[PDB]
Design an enzyme around this catalytic site. Structure first.
Site: not given
Ligand SMILES: Cc1ncc(C[n+]2csc(CCOP(=O)(O)OP(=O)(O)O)c2C)c(N)n1
Ligand SMILES: Cc1ncc(C[n+]2csc(CCOP(=O)(O)OP(=O)(O)O)c2C)c(N)n1
Ligand SMILES: [Ca+2]
Ligand SMILES: [Ca+2]
Ligand code: NA
Ligand code: NA
Lengths: 617, 617
Positions: B183, B240, B314, B362
């Site tokens: 759940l 749960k 850079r 990232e």
């Molecule tokens: C990024 C993110 N999105 C949404 C939530 C809201 N949230 C808190 S607990 C939960 C459910 C977590 O369920 P699960 O990972 O199955 O843990 P369990 O409590 O069942 O062990 C949600 C959606 C959160 N804390 N973080």
């Molecule tokens: C979120 C994100 N992070 C980093 C980059 C920088 N970036 C541009 S193209 C590239 C490499 C992409 O490689 P791939 O997905 O293998 O494509 P290909 O050109 O080999 O077809 C990177 C790291 C980006 N555009 N977006």
């Molecule tokens: Ca769960």
């Protein structure tokens, strides 16, 4: 559906024409990614001139198959196919990346053939999922959706969220093509040409996975032609820079154009391999997408709240959204396993066929919404806790570059949530959404304002954000109150006001409570509710300030940077006689009761009253 | 390593004591997640009282095994184990969520036993990966790392990035325990109790995956005891609310405490199943973590640039980072397949053992850095394009809640990158980083300032961000120039200055060019380089403005909201006689040459000169 011998050779010839165009354009620009185009040339030829069905003179047509270039830096080969298809003039390809052209470095929706901007890797498949979900469940149409990804790109978690979504929702109208060309930007991709591992990952996420030689038109066509019972991943073994002698399969060439002399030599080599000049016409689609009503969306009745009743704006949001679903058959709601907290569950109960459970995957949720809004097919409202929209900021950023019309409602803002603590507290959401260039930021302070924000958002272009709150607060507006984007409301005033206090949500109610306290000491304050933080009603703020000795005090349940106080200060700086005092949250908070935290962080009624007393004295 | 009969029963008894504590604490608070605690009780007992090795009186000890509670809303059972271990007093557990307690709703590092804050789901495994990478490759120590995740949580793409990272880097000292309790918050998790699908997903991502009955101490111990050649996923089938009659395996109970009457009844039932009072002592660790030098980090020499030479910031970043790696053996560098663009490749060349390739992921990269910085084991510098740090904003937000000391360098800021277009342009990064409460925002304008920003960042607590740029710009500072956080520099002045122009990076150089143009018309301007945008040198800005008729003009390669102009306006609003004019980027940009885009978006030399001429007249 195997091409016959003439068509097979024409597809190979087409692939080589696409290589030539990609090289020519990037050499002319002096920048771009011809080696990333060349790995995909057979894929692109087979998609655009064999597998897809679309109107080549009307790329946005609602009946067309969709293509999403997730590896957006291969834009020159997307432009090349649209020239080959007869939509773009071949000569225009040579204006790639020029400020005078619309053939920009990555695709953008000013291009008729682009629905969503890409360039931030890992987002296209989620948009494609929204398009496919819309095609299957809303349009119930025959169009299919194709998304081309890179292999480096598959390191992004957002891709795997989309994979999981597509299998949950049985998107057998969706195909992902993975350009496994071994190399990323600065090194080999982690799995290189371990095709079996890619297959196992895709299968484990519920997809039908087919390994092909990505430079074999034959194998590509066989893979696309297989019966489809699940979303399908065509896992294509390719070489980066395919067809460029001495560059194919080599490092140090990502994002590097061929110099003029080299391009000339390579292009002559490629051109010599082309057997016929006769281009393939795209096959047109079945015209079964339904008409969609794009009339202004009007709530079926005025709000029906009662002044003085207590309701949290999060609950008013859910009530208003459900009502909006009776106003338009186009409204859809999305939520990330938080529907019982955001109250989007109210919409699910009334309009279950138009609710999309996105699970705990906010990045993908935003991308689904973006895809669903393409071609104006739906009007999406996504919800979660506002804090968790930070998890999707790049998707939101790219949504604005995509000129997308999506609506986002983030609940549980500020310290006023109380005991969960800071991980759940949105304290940077105003900063984030204000920075998004196409955004409208609504911060409704009661249930009536919340309902009117939902209605306005539905009819407003761009990235609309509605900030909702956990505490129950009194209704203060009459049901006939007329709200507009960019128009604030003065909710308390007198001829004797000594400060204009600007609050929103919980801090508006704290300001009204402070006013009641202060009136006992014969101190009146004007209280102003911005309604929208962006655009901000500068005129009413200044007119109010000029009636209150020039003095403004802003109080917000948000960090200092990028929020209401900075918006106000930036709007009025330099105006003669105007001063601005700011109360906000100065550091990461902690658990406690809502009222205790408002006090600790200096934004409750007693803090407001103390600030006012100090300003007067 | 199977527990003997007495120990086995003691572990079962411990699990039940942990259930009781979780219920007691959440009933006392009136909020929290006892059912999320109860699914994990046997897991937690086996980890803390059988498998882990740690000093129970010194939770932060560098020799200890690490535990990360990724499903942070199960905080009450983490507190319960530390009471059972003798570190916390049992009575303190009853103060859960009180403003007077440090046992907050989700774990936070004010607790000695918490290294990273959790509560935003899907982030803990990435932090755990950084801890494990550090243990294996930097500390070369015997400690192991354990991370408990929920099943709903596994919908987050960040989890799968961490999975992939751990297998690339062969983290056989890392164990993920998946609490598959069927759940989520508002519905079943997508895969429910399809244990085989979880196993296939983990195996496909390179992990050794073992399915267990998560309420069997026996099976748990066998799984932990298996030989480890890969990162290991223990995939635990649980219920749960396990042990709470009528609540176990039911919906509508996520985040709902038992009422007092019910807690009393349930606790008596659970307590009746406890066979012995004798608690288990934790086994202590092998003390083989090395000493680490925490002395102030000093560059081995002054910068060695030459005034007038051209270098992009850079590139200066990469040069400075490599030099920093000779200043301290603790510096590590991380980058997301962009090392050839950010110039972190220079560090990789000189210090390859301390470079971590994170690939195109990232979110995970930031979490790795956070984990590596825990217990002060390393000083991490992560780099990518600034635009792509938006992909990691929730990780950065949580890093500040985690009181983390990480350094982030984002390149390719603004429109000045030119032809790639807006998908690659950071225009909201100042807004984002300024909103992070523990942040220091460096915006170096030349190579010397860049080197000094790197050195300062290394010695500065909190979230340090360094904004670097693509264009080559002249060195303007002497090598002996002394830089400090919160101190700006006036780079051009005269007694006859008519405006103070504040620029940074490319716009500082545009302002200096404007000054040269304007001096031809006998108009002098003061030019100020902020150095840090946060904290901002308010005093020098105001003193400058007062010398220039009160007039300030800010010009930035960033959107209007949340950037330099708003920071300045907010700092000086209300000061008598001060005016602020702002030039920034007003809409999503497009491809073109750098100089063409600076002109189009109104932030080049000619735009600055026109604004100045208008202010004077
Ligand atoms: C990024 C993110 N999105 C949404 C939530 C809201 N949230 C808190 S607990 C939960 C459910 C977590 O369920 P699960 O990972 O199955 O843990 P369990 O409590 O069942 O062990 C949600 C959606 C959160 N804390 N973080
Ligand atoms: C979120 C994100 N992070 C980093 C980059 C920088 N970036 C541009 S193209 C590239 C490499 C992409 O490689 P791939 O997905 O293998 O494509 P290909 O050109 O080999 O077809 C990177 C790291 C980006 N555009 N977006
Ligand atoms: Ca769960
Ligand atoms: Ca690749
Ligand atoms: Na809208
Ligand atoms: Na630092």
């Amino acid at each position: 559906h195997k091409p016959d011998q003439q068509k097979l050779q024409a597809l190979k010839d087409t692939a080589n024409r696409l290589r030539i165009s990609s090289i020519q354009a990037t050499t002319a620009a002096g920048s771009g990614h011809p080696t990333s185009c060349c790995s995909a040339a057979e894929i692109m030829a087979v998609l655009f001139f064999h597998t897809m069905r679309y109107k080549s003179q009307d790329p946005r047509n609602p009946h067309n198959d969709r293509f999403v270039l997730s590896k957006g830096h291969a834009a020159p080969i997307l432009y090349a196919v649209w020239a080959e298809a007869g939509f773009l003039a071949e000569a225009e390809l040579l204006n790639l990346r020029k400020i005078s052209s619309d053939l920009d470095g990555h695709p953008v929706p000013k291009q008729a053939f682009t629905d969503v901007a890409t360039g931030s890797l890992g987002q296209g498949l989620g948009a494609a999922c929204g398009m496919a979900y819309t095609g299957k469940y809303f349009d119930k149409a025959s169009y299919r959706v194709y998304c081309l990804l890179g292999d480096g790109e598959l390191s992004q978690g957002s891709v795997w969220e989309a994979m999981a979504f597509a299998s949950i929702y049985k998107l057998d109208n969706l195909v992902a093509i993975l350009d496994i060309n071994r190399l990323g930007q600065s090194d080999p991709a982690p799995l290189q040409h371990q095709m079996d591992i890619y297959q196992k990952r895709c299968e484990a996420f519920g997809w039908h996975a087919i390994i092909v030689d990505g430079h074999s038109v034959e194998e590509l066509c066989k893979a696309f032609g297989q019966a489809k019972h699940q979303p399908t991943a065509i896992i294509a073994k390719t070489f980066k820079g395919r067809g460029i002698t001495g560059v194919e399969d080599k490092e140090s060439w990502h994002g590097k154009p061929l110099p003029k002399n080299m391009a000339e030599q390579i292009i002559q080599e490629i051109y010599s391999q082309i057997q016929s000049k006769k281009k393939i016409l795209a096959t047109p689609p079945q015209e079964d997408a339904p008409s969609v009503d794009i009339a202004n969306i009007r709530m079926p009745s005025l709000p029906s709240y009662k002044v003085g009743d207590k309701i949290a704006t999060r609950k008013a949001y859910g009530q208003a959204l459900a009502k909006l679903g009776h106003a338009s058959d186009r409204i859809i709601a999305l939520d990330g396993d938080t529907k019982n907290s955001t109250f989007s569950e109210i919409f699910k109960k009334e309009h279950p066929d138009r609710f999309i459970e996105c699970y705990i995957a906010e990045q993908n949720m935003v991308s689904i919404a973006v895809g669903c809004a393409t071609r104006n097919r739906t009007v999406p409202f996504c919800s979660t806790f506002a804090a968790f929209f930070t998890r999707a900021f790049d998707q939101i950023r790219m949504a604005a570059i995509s000129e997308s019309n999506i609506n986002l409602c983030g609940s549980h803002c500020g310290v006023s949530i109380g005991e969960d603590g800071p991980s759940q507290m949105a304290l940077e959401d105003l900063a984030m959404f204000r920075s998004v260039p196409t955004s409208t930021v609504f911060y409704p302070s009661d249930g009536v304002a919340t309902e009117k924000a939902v209605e306005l958002a539905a009819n407003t272009k761009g990235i609309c954000f509605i900030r909702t709150s956990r505490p129950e607060n009194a209704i203060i507006y009459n049901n006939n109150e007329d709200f507009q984007v960019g128009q604030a409301k003065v909710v308390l005033k007198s001829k004797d006001d000594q400060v204009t206090v600007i609050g929103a949500g919980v801090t508006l109610h704290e300001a009204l409570a402070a006013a009641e306290l202060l009136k006992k000491e014969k101190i009146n304050i004007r209280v102003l509710d911005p309604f929208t933080i962006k655009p901000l009603d500068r005129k009413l703020i200044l007119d109010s300030a000029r009636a209150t000795k020039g003095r403004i005090l802003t109080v917000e349940d948000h960090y200092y940077e990028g929020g209401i106080g900075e918006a106000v200060s930036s709007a009025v700086v330099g105006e003669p006689g105007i001063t601005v005092t700011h109360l906000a949250v100065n550091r990461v908070p902690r658990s406690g009761k809502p009222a205790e935290l408002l006090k600790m962080f200096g934004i409750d009624r007693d803090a407001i009253a103390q600030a006012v007393r100090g300003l007067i004295t």
